[PDB]
Homo-oligomer: A and B are copies of this chain.
Amino acid sequence: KTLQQIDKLICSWLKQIDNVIPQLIMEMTTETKRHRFDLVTNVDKQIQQQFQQFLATYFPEHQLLAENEINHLWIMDPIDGTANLVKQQEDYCIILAYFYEGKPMLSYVYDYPHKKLYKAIRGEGAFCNGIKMEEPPSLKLEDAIISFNAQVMNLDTVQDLFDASFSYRLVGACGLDSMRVAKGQFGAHINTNPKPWDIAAQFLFAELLNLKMTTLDGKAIDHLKGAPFIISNKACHETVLKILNANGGYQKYR
Contacts and interface: CB of A to CB of B under 8 A. Distances in A.
A87 B150 contact: no
B87 A167 contact: yes
B159 A167 contact: no
Interface in A81-129: 83-84, 87-91, 114
Contacts of A21: none
A169 B172 contact: yes
A193 to B, nearest CB: 15
A13 interface: no
B145 A87 contact: yes
A139 to B, nearest CB: 9
Interface of A: 83-84, 87-91, 114, 144-145, 149-151, 155, 158-159, 162, 166-172, 180, 183, 185-186
Q: A-B pairs with the 5 shortest C-beta distances? A: A88-B185, A155-B155, A151-B162, A87-B145, A169-B172
